[PDB]
């Protein structure tokens, strides 16, 4: 993972010099292939006021394979399940070696602001998001208060 390590250091230095507005990320300890990330809940969302933790594990052949990104903070969202898995195409079939962690974080923030109920990782929450939007907003606020604050 020599080439992977150089790109990971490059991304870490770029994040440190130009921090993205609502997200931060960096290695937990001395393992450069394992990062923690924190994302602030978007202001236009029921997740407002919450801080959401994520793990990022880079494969040894990064960036030619996508990083494994998962929430560790529980969250009520049709595209994020109880294992923290994120239904985001760029983390799966649409991964590209031109993508970066900062772009992944921005895309996750947009997913928090605008869920996709038509790609339901959690069908029950997508069902509620489609049929009862205020109920989704109430529960998402409740979970943010309980788990993300």
């Amino acid at each position: 993972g020599s080439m992977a390590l150089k790109r990971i250091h490059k991304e870490l230095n770029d994040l440190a010099r130009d921090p993205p507005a609502q997200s931060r990320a960096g290695p937990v300890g001395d393992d450069m292939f394992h990062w923690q990330a924190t994302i602030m809940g978007p202001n236009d969302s029921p997740y407002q006021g919450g801080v959401f933790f994520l793990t990022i594990h880079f494969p040894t052949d990064y960036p030619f394979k996508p990083p494994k990104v998962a929430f560790t903070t529980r969250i009520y969202h049709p595209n994020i399940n109880s294992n923290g898995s994120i239904c985001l195409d760029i983390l799966r079939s649409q991964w590209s070696p031109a993508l970066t962690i900062s772009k992944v974080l921005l895309s996750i923030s947009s997913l928090l602001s605008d869920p996709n109920p038509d790609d339901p990782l959690v069908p029950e929450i997508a069902r509620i998001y489609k049929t009862d939007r205020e109920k989704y907003n109430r529960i998402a606020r409740e979970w943010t208060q309980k788990y993300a604050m």
Partner: protein, 71 residues
């Protein structure tokens, strides 16, 4: 599904010159220097030869615009 060595070798290659405008390879996020070998796709996006060839050994699309490299 990736491309064969023959299909990859059919794509245009150039050496970064002393007078060339500076660009950065999107795969390794490293700026080109004189002597670097660059490979350009039919969509006109270009990369380090070693960077894009490794991607195209298991994939068939441009990392930037996601167009298919082959016809």
């Amino acid at each position: 599904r990736g491309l064969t060595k023959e299909q990859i070798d059919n794509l245009a290659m150039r050496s970064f010159g002393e007078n060339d405008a500076l660009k950065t390879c999107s795969v390794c996020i490293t700026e080109y220097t004189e002597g670097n070998k660059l490979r350009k796709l039919p969509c006109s996006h270009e990369y380090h030869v070693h960077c894009i060839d490794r991607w195209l050994s298991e994939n068939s699309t441009c990392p930037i615009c996601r167009r298919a490299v082959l016809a």
